[PDB]
Amino acid sequence: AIPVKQFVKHIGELYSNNQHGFSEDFEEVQRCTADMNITAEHSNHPENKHKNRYINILAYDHSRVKLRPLPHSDYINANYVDGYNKAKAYIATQGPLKSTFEDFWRMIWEQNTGIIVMITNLVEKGRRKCDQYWPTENSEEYGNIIVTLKSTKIHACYTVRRFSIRNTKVKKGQKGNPKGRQNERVVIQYHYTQWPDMGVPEYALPVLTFVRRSSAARMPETGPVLVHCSAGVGRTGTYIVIDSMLQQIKDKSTVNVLGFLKHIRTQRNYLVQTEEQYIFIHDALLEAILGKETEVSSNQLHSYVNSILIPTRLEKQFKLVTQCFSAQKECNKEKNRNSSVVPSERARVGLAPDYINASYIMGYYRSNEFIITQHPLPHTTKDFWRMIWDHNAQIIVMLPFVYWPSREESMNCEAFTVTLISKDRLCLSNEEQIIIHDFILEATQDDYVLEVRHFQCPKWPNPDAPISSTFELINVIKEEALTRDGPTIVHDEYGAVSAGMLCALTTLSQQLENENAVDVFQVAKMINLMRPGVFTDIEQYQFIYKAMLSLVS
């Protein structure tokens, strides 16, 4: 209904006049089925009461997925929901209950479903949101369906779990069969793990990446993709609309959020659930239209790098990377070395009892894998060690004033003490050294001890070793991180380019290693979104490309 060129302009008009357009629109979505008198009598039947997570969240009779009768057994709180150019593309359903685990897996068998999108954690902020309907390891039995965990792939924002499910009351087929045994199928669960328990995601990028990967995983001649959260309406509907519109844009170069959303609200109630979720659909789709696509396979990286350097797509990416903080901003400016490099509000590292100049930064495997901070000032050394302590951080990378204790005198922080236990050194290629100091932080009013290793690195990157030697130091930190818990603290002077570059290059090399793909823009954009002024010159950004290129061999 809206050509994709009109969208920058379209969202501007929805945002304008105190966002009156968004408000009107979402109110229209809220009232657009009232007059249709859509019934949900099976949902409301007393016998199905225990099979509903919430009393208010129902499955409309006309679009509800029905289970085959067994000798009210037909009922599940799930509805078919259209996609783009496809009827019944999704089953949208609640987070299953222990009492409905069987029904859930039975419905996945009966509908020929191969993909589950789970957009919730099990427990969020002390509240049970979803029961665990899959085996932690090995196998578990849900009536006639045996569900086996085959593999788990963990990323920062989502986890992929490959399952084989076996229906014991279904025939095995012919032995020669290339498709395998016909009473077994693969189900892949794409589980988003970083959705806030309050409101909508701060960053559309990792959500867009999740939507795109989970969606492209739909195989032909397959049943509906199952999408659930807790209620199976808000995050679920959000997903379905960004997915469907992602596919509409690709095909027609139009976008139709309101009309499509009003349609699917005939299919399940309280799709999508909040005005803030409505706005996030728009934000994220706009972000999709404008950010192009930047993930590039290993065997395309050389050619891609070539064409982004010719007038330039590198320059246009970097303006988006450098587009990028209230507390910093502050009665805290004498805690900052340079207040052009400070944390955002969302990524700010809080001290338990407020401010330290430090930012959470994402890694490949975990959000909050790193903390990028500044070299501690003498009046910021107690705060620095309080951060280590509060976050149970066991690794400090210093990239060049001693803020650490000597053997003679321990450091007293009220809650704990810092004590050196040994000093040492690792060697590198050009006779370069990393100085190591090992500290223990012992609680003063408890018995906990935290082992913290400190790396003083040479000048890095070394401009007169091959660019591929940049990863030697990265690989040393990776290998230490394997044996330790908590975040990795990385600081240079301000928490700027050298700190960011260790984080970016670590992330991107874990990506190339694990996916044979690299997304330099996303990694660089997220670092700058979480801490403004890490990457400021285009040559630093180009060096991320050049460096990653040297590993493609």
Residue numbers in the entry: 827 to 897, 903 to 1142, 1148 to 1160, 1168 to 1196, 1204 to 1250, 1260 to 1412
What did the study's authors say about this model?
The ∼280 residue PTP catalytic domain consists of an α/β structure, and biochemical and structural studies have led to a detailed understanding of the catalytic mechanism (Barford et al., 1994; Zhang, 2002). Key features of the domain include the PTP signature motif, the mobile Trp-Pro-Asp “WPD” loop that in the closed conformation positions the conserved and catalytically important aspartate residue, and the phosphotyrosine recognition loop.
We also report here structures of two tandem-domain RPTPs, RPTPɛ and RPTPγ, revealing the domain organization for the PTP subgroups R4 and R5. In contrast RPTPγ showed significant and concentration-dependent dimerization. The experimental data fit well to a self-association model resulting in determination of a dissociation constant (KD) of 3.5 ± 0.3 μM. Analysis of the RPTPγ tandem-domain structure revealed that RPTPγ associated with a symmetry-related molecule as a “head-to-toe” dimer (i.e., with the D1 domain of one molecule interacting with the D2 domain of a second molecule and vice versa). The interaction between RPTPγ monomers involves extensive electrostatic interactions from the active site D1 domain of one RPTPγ molecule, visible as a highly electropositive pocket, interacting with an electronegative surface of the D2 from the other molecule. In this dimeric form, the active site of RPTPγ is occluded by the D2 domain of the interacting molecule, suggesting that dimerization in this conformation would prevent substrate access leading to suppression of enzymatic activity. In RPTPγ mutant “RKEE” residues, Arg958 and Lys960 of the D1 domain were mutated to glutamic acid, and in mutant “DDKK” residues, Asp1305 and Asp1306 of the D2 domain were mutated to lysine.
